[PDB]
């Protein structure tokens, strides 16, 4: 979905493998704030919110607490005390169209 | 602004009481050995105060 209509999914009551995601090395940006990337597999959480959208590359760093920009201000703003991770990966091989 | 004051940010373990650390080696955040080379999962442990 669009960034202004960023897709929200709720994850609960399952085993979530974050070691493979961390060791995938297929994601350009992997920044966790408020959590330990190595301890992600070692913790249990009441609920997970998966927030999916597509942006430009230069705005990838803008999806982080304390960041500013059009997307941050008007599309999706992260709180200063945000607890979670951001995973961004290029989609040129899938989002390339003629014209 | 003054950035002359430095603080270490990344270390393998917590400091023992009254420990002094001066090493400037790049901390291996990931699985790829930094070998003194920064990049992904390889960041300088020292940061300046704003």
């Amino acid at each position, epitope marked *: 979905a669009s960034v202004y209509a960023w897709n929200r999914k709720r994850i609960s009551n399952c085993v979530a493998d974050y070691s493979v995601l961390y060791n995938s090395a297929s994601f350009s940006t992997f920044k966790c704030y408020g959590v330990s990337p190595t301890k992600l597999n070692d913790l249990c959480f009441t609920n997970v919110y998966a927030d999916s959208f597509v942006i430009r590359g230069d705005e990838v760093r803008q999806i982080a607490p304390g960041q500013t920009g059009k997307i941050a201000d008007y599309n999706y703003k992260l709180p200063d005390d945000f607890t979670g991770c951001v995973i961004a990966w290029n989609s040129n091989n899938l989002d390339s169209k003629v014209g | 602004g003054n950035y002359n004051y430095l603080y270490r940010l990344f270390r393998k373990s917590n400091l023992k009481p009254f420990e002094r650390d001066i090493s400037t080696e790049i901390y291996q955040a990931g699985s790829t050995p930094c070998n003194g080379v920064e990049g992904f999962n390889c960041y300088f442990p*020292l940061q300046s105060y704003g």
Partner: nanobody
Amino acid sequence: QVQLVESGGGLVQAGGSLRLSCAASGFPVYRDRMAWYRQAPGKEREWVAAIYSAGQQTRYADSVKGRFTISRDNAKNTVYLQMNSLKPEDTAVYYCNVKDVGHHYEYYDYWGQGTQVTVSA
């Protein structure tokens, strides 16, 4: 607060000497670390060069030793990058990078606009 602007670059024939000037406003250049990164279309970002005020002054990639030089000017607060004996594979957009710390543990990778560099064999 912190503003970084890059000047220089362009298209050059291999083996020459080129100048890049990263002008920084809002903070003295004498700090923990000033980095230089390059990005090319179709590949991920990698660390290229860095200069430190403590321990080892300069760090470069193992394949670029002895070809790129960096320096700082505190009087006018500028970072100078002199690159000599370039290769066509070095065609990329270059950025001067600094790292800043926020009040709530946030860390910002402040970059400039960047300059495009092309080398012709």
